[PDB]
Each structure stands twice: as structure tokens, then as C-alpha cells.
Short mmCIF file of C-alpha atoms in Angstrom, two decimals:
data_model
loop_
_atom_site.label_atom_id
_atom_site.label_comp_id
_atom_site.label_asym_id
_atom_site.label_seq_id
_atom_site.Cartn_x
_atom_site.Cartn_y
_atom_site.Cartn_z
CA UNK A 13 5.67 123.43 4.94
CA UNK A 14 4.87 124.48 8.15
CA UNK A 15 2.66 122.54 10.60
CA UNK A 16 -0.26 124.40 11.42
CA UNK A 17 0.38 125.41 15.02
CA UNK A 18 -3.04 124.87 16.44
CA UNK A 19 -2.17 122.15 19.91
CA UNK A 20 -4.53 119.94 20.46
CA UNK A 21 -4.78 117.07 23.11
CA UNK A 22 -4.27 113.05 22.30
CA UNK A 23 -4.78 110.27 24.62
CA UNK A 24 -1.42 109.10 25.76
CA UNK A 25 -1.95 106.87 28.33
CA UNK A 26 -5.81 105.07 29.40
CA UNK A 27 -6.93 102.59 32.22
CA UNK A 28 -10.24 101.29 31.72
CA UNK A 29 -12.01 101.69 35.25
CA UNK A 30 -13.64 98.93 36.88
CA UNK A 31 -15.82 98.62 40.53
CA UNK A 32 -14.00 96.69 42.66
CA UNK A 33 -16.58 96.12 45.09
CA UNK A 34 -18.72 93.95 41.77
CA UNK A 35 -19.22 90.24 42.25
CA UNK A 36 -20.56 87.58 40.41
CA UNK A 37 -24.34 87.01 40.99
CA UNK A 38 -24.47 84.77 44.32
CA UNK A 39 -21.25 85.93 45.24
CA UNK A 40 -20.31 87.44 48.71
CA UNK A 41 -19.54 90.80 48.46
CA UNK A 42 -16.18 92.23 48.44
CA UNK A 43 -14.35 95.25 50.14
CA UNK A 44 -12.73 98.05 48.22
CA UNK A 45 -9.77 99.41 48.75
CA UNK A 46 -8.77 102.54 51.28
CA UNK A 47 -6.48 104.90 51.54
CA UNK A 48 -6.30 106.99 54.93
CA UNK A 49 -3.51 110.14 54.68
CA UNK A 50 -1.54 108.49 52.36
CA UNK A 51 0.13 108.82 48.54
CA UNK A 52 -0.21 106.77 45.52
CA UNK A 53 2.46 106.78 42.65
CA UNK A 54 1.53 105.24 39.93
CA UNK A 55 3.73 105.01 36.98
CA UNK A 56 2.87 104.75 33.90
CA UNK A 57 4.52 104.56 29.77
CA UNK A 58 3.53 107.28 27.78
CA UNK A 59 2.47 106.36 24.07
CA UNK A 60 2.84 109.98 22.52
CA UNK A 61 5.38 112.53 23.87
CA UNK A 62 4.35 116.69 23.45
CA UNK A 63 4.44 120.19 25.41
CA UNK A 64 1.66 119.68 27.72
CA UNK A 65 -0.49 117.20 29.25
CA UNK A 66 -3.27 116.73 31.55
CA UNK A 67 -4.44 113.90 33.60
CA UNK A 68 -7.50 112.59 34.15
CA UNK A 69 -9.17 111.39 37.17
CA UNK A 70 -12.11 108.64 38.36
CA UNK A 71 -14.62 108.31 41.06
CA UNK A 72 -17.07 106.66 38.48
CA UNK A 73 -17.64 103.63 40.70
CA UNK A 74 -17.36 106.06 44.01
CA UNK A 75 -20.69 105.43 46.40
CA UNK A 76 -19.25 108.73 48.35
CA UNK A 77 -17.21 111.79 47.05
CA UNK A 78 -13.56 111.74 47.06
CA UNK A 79 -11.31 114.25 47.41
CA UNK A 80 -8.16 114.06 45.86
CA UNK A 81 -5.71 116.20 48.50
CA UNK A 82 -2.71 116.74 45.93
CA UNK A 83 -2.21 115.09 42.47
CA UNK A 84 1.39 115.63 40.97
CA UNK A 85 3.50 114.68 38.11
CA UNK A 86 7.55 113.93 37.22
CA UNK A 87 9.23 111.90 35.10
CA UNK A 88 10.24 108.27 36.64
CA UNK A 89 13.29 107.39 36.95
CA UNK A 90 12.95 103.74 37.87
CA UNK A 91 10.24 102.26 40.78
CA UNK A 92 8.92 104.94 43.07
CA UNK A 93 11.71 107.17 41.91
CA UNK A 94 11.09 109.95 40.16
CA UNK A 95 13.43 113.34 38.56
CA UNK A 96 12.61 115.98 41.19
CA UNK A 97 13.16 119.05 38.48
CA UNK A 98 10.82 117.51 36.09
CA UNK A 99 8.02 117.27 39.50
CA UNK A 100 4.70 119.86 38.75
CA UNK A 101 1.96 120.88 40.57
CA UNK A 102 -1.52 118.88 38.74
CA UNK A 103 -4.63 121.36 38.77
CA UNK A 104 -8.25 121.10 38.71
CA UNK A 105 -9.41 124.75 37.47
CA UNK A 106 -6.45 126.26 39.12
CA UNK A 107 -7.05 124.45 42.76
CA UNK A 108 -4.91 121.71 43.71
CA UNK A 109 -6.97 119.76 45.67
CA UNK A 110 -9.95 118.69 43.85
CA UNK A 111 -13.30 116.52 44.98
CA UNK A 112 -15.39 114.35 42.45
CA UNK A 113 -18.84 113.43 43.01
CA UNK A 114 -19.34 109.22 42.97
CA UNK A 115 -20.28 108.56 39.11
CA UNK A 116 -17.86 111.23 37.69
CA UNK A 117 -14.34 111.30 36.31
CA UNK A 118 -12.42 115.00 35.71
CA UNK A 119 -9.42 116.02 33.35
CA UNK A 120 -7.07 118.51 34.64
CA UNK A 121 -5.86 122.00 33.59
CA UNK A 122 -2.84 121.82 31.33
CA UNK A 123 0.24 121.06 33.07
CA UNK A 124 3.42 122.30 31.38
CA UNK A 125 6.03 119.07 30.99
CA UNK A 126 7.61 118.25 27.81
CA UNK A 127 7.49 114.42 27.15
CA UNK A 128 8.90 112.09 24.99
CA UNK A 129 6.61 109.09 23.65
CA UNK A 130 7.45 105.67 24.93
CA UNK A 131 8.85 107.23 28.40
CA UNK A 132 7.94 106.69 31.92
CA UNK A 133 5.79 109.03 33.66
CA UNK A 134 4.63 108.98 37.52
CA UNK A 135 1.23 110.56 38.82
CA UNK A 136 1.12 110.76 42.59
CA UNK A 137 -1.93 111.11 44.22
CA UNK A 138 -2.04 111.80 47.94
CA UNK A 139 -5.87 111.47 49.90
CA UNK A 140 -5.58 113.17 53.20
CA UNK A 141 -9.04 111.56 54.37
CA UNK A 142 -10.29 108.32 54.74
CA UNK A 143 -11.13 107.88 51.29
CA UNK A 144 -12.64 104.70 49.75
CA UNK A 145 -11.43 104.09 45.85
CA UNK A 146 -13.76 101.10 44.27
CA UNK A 147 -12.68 102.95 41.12
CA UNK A 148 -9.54 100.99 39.88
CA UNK A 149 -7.76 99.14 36.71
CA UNK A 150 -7.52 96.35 38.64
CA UNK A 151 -4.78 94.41 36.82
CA UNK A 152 -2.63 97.19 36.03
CA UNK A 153 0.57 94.60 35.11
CA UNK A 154 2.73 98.02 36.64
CA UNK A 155 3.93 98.51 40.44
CA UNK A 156 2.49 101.45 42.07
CA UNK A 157 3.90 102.34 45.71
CA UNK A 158 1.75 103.64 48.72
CA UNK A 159 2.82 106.06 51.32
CA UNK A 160 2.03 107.58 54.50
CA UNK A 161 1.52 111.16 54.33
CA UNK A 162 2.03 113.31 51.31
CA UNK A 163 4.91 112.40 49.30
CA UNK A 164 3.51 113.15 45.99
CA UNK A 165 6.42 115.26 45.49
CA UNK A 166 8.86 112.89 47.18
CA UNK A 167 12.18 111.23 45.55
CA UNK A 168 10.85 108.25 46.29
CA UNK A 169 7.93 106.62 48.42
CA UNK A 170 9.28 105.68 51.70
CA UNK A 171 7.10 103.15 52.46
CA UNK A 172 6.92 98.87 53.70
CA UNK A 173 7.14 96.83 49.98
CA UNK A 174 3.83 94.83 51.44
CA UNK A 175 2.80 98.42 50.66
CA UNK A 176 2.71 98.13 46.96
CA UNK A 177 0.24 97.33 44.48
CA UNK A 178 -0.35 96.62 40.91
CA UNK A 179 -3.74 98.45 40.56
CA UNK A 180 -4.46 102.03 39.41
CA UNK A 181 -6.45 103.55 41.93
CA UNK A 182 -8.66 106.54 40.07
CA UNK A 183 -6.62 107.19 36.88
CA UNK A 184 -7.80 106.45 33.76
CA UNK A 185 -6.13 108.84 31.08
CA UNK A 186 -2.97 111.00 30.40
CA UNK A 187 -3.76 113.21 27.60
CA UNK A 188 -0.34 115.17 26.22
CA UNK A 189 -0.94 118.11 23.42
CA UNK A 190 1.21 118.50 20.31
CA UNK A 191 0.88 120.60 16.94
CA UNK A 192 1.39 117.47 14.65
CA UNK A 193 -1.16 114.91 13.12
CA UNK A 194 -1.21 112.26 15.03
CA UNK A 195 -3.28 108.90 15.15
CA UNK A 196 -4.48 107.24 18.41
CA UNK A 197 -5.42 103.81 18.32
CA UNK A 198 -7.78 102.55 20.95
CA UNK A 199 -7.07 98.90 21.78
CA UNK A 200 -10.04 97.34 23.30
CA UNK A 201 -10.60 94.21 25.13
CA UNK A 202 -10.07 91.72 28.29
CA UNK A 203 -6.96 90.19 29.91
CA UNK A 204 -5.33 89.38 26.56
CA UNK A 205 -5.38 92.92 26.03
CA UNK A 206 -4.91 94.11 29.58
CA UNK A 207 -1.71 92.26 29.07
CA UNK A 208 -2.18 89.38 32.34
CA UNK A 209 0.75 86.87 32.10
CA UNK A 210 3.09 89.76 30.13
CA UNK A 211 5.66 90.61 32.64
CA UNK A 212 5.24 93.05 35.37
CA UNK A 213 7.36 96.44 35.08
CA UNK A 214 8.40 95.92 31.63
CA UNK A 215 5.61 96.93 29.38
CA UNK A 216 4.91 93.78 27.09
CA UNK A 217 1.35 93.83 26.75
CA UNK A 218 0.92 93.49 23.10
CA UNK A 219 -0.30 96.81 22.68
CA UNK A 220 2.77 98.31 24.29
CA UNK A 221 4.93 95.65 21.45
CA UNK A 222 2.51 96.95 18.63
CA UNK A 223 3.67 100.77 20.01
CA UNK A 224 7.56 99.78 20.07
CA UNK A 225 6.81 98.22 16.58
CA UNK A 226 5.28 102.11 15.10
CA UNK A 227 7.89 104.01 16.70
CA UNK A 228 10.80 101.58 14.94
CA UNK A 229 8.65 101.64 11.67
CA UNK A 230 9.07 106.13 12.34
CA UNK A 231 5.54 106.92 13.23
CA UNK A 232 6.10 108.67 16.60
CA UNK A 233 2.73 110.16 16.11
CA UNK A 234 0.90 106.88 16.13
CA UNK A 235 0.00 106.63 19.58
CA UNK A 236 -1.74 103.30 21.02
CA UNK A 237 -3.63 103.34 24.54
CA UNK A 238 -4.61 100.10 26.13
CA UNK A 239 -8.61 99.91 26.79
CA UNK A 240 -8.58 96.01 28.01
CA UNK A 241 -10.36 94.73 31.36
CA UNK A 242 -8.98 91.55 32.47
CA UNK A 243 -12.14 89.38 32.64
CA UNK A 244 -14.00 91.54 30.41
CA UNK A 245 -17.69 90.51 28.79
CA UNK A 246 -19.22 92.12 26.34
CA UNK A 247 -23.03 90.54 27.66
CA UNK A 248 -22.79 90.82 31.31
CA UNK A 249 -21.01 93.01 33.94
CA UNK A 250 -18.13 91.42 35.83
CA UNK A 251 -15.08 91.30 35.31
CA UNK A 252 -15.64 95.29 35.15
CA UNK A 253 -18.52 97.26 32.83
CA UNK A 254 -19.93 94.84 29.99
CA UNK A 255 -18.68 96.01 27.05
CA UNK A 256 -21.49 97.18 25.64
CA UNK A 257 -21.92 99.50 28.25
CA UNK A 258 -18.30 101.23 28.35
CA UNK A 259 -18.48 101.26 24.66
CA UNK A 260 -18.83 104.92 24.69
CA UNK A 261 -16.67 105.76 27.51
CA UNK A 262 -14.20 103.65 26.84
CA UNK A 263 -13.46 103.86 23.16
CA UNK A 264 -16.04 106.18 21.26
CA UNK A 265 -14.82 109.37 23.42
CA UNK A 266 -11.07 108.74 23.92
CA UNK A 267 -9.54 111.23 23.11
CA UNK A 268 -8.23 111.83 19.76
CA UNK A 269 -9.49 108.54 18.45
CA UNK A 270 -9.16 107.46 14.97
CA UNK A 271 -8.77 104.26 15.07
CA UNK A 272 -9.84 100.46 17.06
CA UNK A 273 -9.05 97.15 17.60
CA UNK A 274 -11.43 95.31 19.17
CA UNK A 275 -10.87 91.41 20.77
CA UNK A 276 -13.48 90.65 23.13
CA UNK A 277 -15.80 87.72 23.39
CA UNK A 278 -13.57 84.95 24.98
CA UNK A 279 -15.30 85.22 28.62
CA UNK A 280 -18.88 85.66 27.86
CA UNK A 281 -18.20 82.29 26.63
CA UNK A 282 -15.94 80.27 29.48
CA UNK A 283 -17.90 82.30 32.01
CA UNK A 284 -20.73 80.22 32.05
CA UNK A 285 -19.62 76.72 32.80
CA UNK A 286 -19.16 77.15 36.20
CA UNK A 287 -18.35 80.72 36.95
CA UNK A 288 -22.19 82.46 36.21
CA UNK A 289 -23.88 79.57 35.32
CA UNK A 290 -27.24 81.87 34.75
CA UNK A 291 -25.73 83.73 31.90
CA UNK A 292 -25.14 81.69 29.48
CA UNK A 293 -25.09 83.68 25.90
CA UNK A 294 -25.23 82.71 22.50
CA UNK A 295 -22.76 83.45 19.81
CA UNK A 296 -25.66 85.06 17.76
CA UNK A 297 -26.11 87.43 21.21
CA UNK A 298 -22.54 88.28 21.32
CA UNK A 299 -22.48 89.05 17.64
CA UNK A 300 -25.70 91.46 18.04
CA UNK A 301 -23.58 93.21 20.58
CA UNK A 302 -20.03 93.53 18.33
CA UNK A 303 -22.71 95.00 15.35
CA UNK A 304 -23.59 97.41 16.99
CA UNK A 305 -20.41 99.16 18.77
CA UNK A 306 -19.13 98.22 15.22
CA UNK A 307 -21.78 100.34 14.07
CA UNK A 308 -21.55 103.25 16.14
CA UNK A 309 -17.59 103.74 15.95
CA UNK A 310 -18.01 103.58 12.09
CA UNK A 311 -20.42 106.57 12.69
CA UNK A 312 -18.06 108.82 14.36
CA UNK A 313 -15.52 107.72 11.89
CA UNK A 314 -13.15 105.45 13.43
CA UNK A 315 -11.52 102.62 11.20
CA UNK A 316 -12.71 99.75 13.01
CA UNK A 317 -10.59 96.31 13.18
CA UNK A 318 -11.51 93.07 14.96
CA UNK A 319 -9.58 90.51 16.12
CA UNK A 320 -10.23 86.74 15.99
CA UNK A 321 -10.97 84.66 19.49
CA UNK A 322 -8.19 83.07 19.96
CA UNK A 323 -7.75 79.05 20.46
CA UNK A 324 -7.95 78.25 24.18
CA UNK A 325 -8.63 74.34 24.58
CA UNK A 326 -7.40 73.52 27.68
CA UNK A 327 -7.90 76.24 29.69
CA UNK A 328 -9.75 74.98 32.42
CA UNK A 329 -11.15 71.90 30.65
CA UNK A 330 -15.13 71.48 31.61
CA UNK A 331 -15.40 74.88 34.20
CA UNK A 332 -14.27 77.68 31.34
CA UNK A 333 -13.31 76.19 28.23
CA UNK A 334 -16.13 73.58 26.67
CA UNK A 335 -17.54 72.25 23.37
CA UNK A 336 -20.32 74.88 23.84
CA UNK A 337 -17.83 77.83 23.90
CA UNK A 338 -15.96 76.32 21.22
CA UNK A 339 -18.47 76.20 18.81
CA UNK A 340 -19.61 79.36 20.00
CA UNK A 341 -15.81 80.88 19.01
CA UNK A 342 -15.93 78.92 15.84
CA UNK A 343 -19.53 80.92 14.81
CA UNK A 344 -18.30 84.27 15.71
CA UNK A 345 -14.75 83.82 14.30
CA UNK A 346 -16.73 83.27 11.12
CA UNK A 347 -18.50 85.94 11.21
CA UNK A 348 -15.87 88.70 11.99
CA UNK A 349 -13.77 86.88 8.67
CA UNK A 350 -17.08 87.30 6.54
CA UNK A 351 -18.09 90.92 7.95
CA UNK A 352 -18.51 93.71 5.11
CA UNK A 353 -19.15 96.07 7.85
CA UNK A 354 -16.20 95.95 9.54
CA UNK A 355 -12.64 98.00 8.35
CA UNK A 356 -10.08 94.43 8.68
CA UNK A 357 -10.21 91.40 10.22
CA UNK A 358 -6.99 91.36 12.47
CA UNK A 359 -6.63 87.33 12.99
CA UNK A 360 -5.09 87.27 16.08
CA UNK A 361 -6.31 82.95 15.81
CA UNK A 362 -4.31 82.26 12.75
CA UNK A 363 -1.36 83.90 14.11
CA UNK A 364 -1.60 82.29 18.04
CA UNK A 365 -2.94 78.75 17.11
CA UNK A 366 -0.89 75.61 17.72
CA UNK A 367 0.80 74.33 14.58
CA UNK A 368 -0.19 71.14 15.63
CA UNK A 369 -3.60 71.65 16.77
CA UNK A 370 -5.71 74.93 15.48
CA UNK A 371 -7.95 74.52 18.59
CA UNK A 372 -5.21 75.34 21.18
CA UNK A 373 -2.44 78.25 21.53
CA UNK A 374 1.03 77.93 20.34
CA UNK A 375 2.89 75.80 22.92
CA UNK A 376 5.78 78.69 21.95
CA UNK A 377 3.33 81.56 23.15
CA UNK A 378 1.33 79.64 25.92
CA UNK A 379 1.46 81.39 29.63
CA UNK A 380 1.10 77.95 31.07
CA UNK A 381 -2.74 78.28 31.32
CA UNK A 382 -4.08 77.72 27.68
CA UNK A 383 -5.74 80.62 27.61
CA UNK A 384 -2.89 83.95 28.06
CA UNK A 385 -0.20 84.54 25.86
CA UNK A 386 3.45 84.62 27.46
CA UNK A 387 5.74 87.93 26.28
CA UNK A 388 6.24 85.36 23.45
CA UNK A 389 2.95 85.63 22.39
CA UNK A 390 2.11 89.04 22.95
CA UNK A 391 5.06 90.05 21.03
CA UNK A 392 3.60 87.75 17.74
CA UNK A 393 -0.01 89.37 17.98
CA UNK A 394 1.44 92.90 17.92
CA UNK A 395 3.65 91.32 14.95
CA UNK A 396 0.63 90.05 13.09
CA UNK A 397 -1.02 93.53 12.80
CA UNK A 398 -0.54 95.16 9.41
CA UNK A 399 0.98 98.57 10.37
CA UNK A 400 -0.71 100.12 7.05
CA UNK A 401 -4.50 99.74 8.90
CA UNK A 402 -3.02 102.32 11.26
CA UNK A 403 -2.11 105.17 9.35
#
């Protein structure tokens, strides 16, 4: 009959935040990034389309306040363009300028744009003060273009192209309302599911090729939002939050969750060779961390799926990849195929390993470093996932 009108919001878009100003233990330390009178347009693919949305905002790494001067939205058109008509005013309890303590993130009063699922958005941010943002996505694997001034509501950002960057500077979510039921699928994980090696621009991270594969199947209403950290642990911090510890933020209170897929594990093994010798982990330790996010997303009710490590022997023979981390993989690829607790296995191993040799990647699907699938491969793990776990 029909639907129950009651709107609610869905994540549509996510960026899991990281600190850029984190090293490795020993390391020197490293600057953040600063933006003095100047706008940031990001762009960014929309999963599910609706009436409304809102956008949310970061300073969780902040050591200061930030203000953000002016935050807009439009629909792109292409680069830094964007449709001028389609441009609206983003609000923070009616104000638009809007300041965020350092530790905090903020969602944004409704913003009235009707949007299609699997289009192009672009949030512009403009920070008339010297404002440091250590809150990023670092590898965003998406062109955003910086500006002098405010040109949030610009055609286009006038601006040098050494004045580009493929970060996301303080946004983590773009939430969009709709009447309908609708599924959101969390995908969780480091560079393989940040997307590093898919091309730049052109949204082939494999959870953008699982999306395209839902909306050809008909399910519009399946949405998929990308929760990976290139470099990712789940033991130790660096690259970003451990896993363990952005857990919550990251997957158990998206919103509009119902559903995971969680492929993490590869770095707090080749991390320890050579990159933080002093924390070396054990599978057993990684698998005491998986039990229990496992445990706590089956708690709130999300269907919970884990992929398979994937082969990577060769990638940097002796400093990442060793006989340690592969029979580390090897224990904790077992265990995820023999778990009762979890909802499916999604074996992203069986599908990516090398015909020839089950310990490396496909040749067909290999970035060039052993370790990141090409388009190629990205494309086959979104292939290999069983659309029925998503409904």
C-alpha cells in the first residue's frame, strides 16, 4: 500500500577521520594541514538519493576549536564545478557559521535538496581564520580544490591546481532522509577498503562497485558507505584510530546501520617487520579484538560479515610481508571460515588469490605492489559478495 510517511535519516556518504599529526612510535612528528581565509570543495558520490540531507562535520582530532565560516552544498557538475540553482545555505541550529570544540564532530540542520543515489554532490567549506584541520580522511581517492576567500558558493574554485588535494578535511558523513525502507551497509576496513590503487575521480573502490552492482540488481534503497582507513590496525593506532577504538564511532553508530562487512587485520601484521617493530601482535590478539566488535554489532543487531585477509606475498618481501604474518593470516583466515558467531564469511582470499599460487594476489587484479587490488580487482571483490546477505 502506502509507505508509511514517517522520514527518517540514512548515512549516504562517510569518511572515517584520522589525526594527521599521528606518527609511528620513534617517529618525528608531523605538521597538519592549514587553511588561512580560504574554501574547500570536496566532492563526494552519494550512495542513497532522498528529500533532505544534512552533513556532518569533524574537529575530533582538533587540539584548538575551529570555526567553520560557511559550509554549503550543490550538486557537481564535474571537478570544482558545481549547478549554481541546486547551491544551499548548510546550517548548524539555524547559524551558518558554526565552531566545534577539539574532540567533537556536529551534524547539521536539514537542508532541503532532492538527490538521486549514485550522484555527485559538493560540500564547500570556507575557514575565514587561521584554522588548523588534523581532522582528515587522509586518502580520500577524490580531488578536492582549495580557494582563496569564500567561494563556497562559487561556479567553480578559482584557484593554482598545486592547490588541490585528495584529502577530506573535517567531513565525515552526508546523511539524506527518505520515507522508504532502506538498508545501509557499513563497509569497514584499511586501504583495500579505502579503495588506494582504484583510480582517482572515478569511484572504483570496491564498495562504490558493490553499490553500482545493488542499484543494477534494483535495490536503490541499499545504500553502502565506505568506513576504510588506509593503513588501518585493529591493535595499535596509526595509520588512523585502531580499530578497536573507532569501533563505535565508526560503524556501531552510523547512521541507519543494518548491516557490516568487516576486512581488517592485514597491517597489524606487515606493520611489525620494520615499520613498529615494538608491536608485534599475535593472530590469537587480533582475533580477541574481531570477537568482540563482532560481538557488540550482533548486540545492536547488525548482520555482521567478515572478509578473508587476502594473499599478499610479495609485498615488500622481509619489511611488511613475512612468514610470521603469513602464518598469522593463515590462523585468522581459519578462524573467520570456522566462526559460528559471525552472520557469513565473505572470502574476499578465495576470490583475489593467484590461480597459480594461493599465497599471492591474482596477477589479473594486482596494483603492481602485491598487496592492493587494481580497478580489476576491486571490481571482483564487490563481485564475490552474495547480494542476498544484504537485504
Amino acid at each position: 500500500g502506502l509507505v508509511p510517511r514517517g522520514s527518517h535519516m540514512y548515512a549516504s556518504w562517510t569518511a572515517s577521520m584520522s589525526d594527521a599529526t599521528q606518527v609511528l612510535p620513534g617517529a618525528a612528528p608531523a605538521a597538519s594541514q592549514s587553511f588561512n581565509n580560504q574554501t574547500v570543495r570536496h566532492v563526494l558520490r552519494l550512495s542513497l538519493g532522498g528529500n533532505t540531507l544534512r552533513v556532518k562535520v569533524s574537529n575530533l582530532f582538533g587540539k584548538s576549536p575551529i570555526t567553520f565560516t560557511a559550509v554549503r552544498v550543490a550538486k557537481s557538475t564535474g571537478q570544482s564545478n558545481i549547478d549554481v540553482s541546486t547551491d544551499k545555505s548548510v546550517t548548524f541550529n539555524g547559524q551558518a557559521s558554526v565552531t566545534l570544540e577539539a574532540g567533537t564532530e556536529l551534524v547539521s540542520d536539514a537542508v532541503n535538496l532532492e538527490v538521486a543515489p549514485l550522484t555527485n554532490i559538493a560540500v564547500s567549506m570556507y575557514f575565514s581564520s587561521p584554522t588548523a584541520m588534523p581532522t582528515v580522511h587522509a586518502l580520500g581517492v577524490q580531488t578536492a580544490f582549495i580557494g582563496a576567500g569564500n567561494q563556497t558558493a562559487a561556479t567553480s574554485i578559482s584557484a593554482a591546481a598545486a592547490d588541490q588535494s585528495q584529502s577530506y578535511y573535517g567531513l565525515t558523513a552526508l546523511e539524506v532522509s527518505s520515507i522508504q525502507k532502506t538498508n545501509v551497509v557499513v563497509t569497514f576496513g584499511d586501504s583495500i577498503t579505502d579503495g588506494y590503487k582504484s583510480t582517482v575521480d572515478a569511484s572504483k573502490r570496491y564498495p562504490n562497485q558493490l553499490d553500482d552492482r545493488l542499484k543494477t540488481a534494483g535495490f536503490s534503497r541499499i545504500g553502502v558507505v565506505n568506513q576504510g582507513i588506509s593503513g588501518n590496525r585493529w591493535l595499535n593506532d596509526f595509520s588512523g584510530p585502531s580499530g578497536t577504538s573507532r569501533f563505535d564511532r565508526d560503524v556501531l553508530n552510523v547512521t541507519g546501520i543494518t548491516h557490516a562487512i568487516i576486512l581488517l587485520g592485514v597491517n597489524d601484521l606487515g606493520f611489525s617487520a620494520w615499520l613498529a617493530p615494538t608491536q608485534t601482535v599475535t593472530a590469537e590478539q587480533v582475533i580477541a579484538a574481531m570477537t568482540t566488535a563482532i560481538v557488540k554489532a550482533k548486540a545492536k543487531g547488525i548482520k555482521v560479515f567478515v572478509g578473508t585477509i587476502i594473499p599478499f606475498k610479495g609485498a615488500s618481501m622481509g619489511y611488511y610481508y613475512t612468514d610470521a604474518a603469513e602464518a598469522k593470516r593463515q590462523t585468522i583466515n581459519t578462524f573467520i571460515r570456522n566462526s559460528k558467531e559471525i552472520d557469513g564469511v565473505i572470502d574476499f582470499a578465495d576470490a583475489l588469490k593467484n590461480p597459480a599460487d594461493p599465497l599471492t594476489i591474482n596477477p589479473i587484479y594486482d596494483s603492481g605492489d602485491a598487496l592492493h587490488p587494481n580497478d580489476a580487482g576491486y571490481e571482483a571483490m564487490a563481485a564475490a559478495i552474495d547480494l542476498s546477505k544484504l537485504q
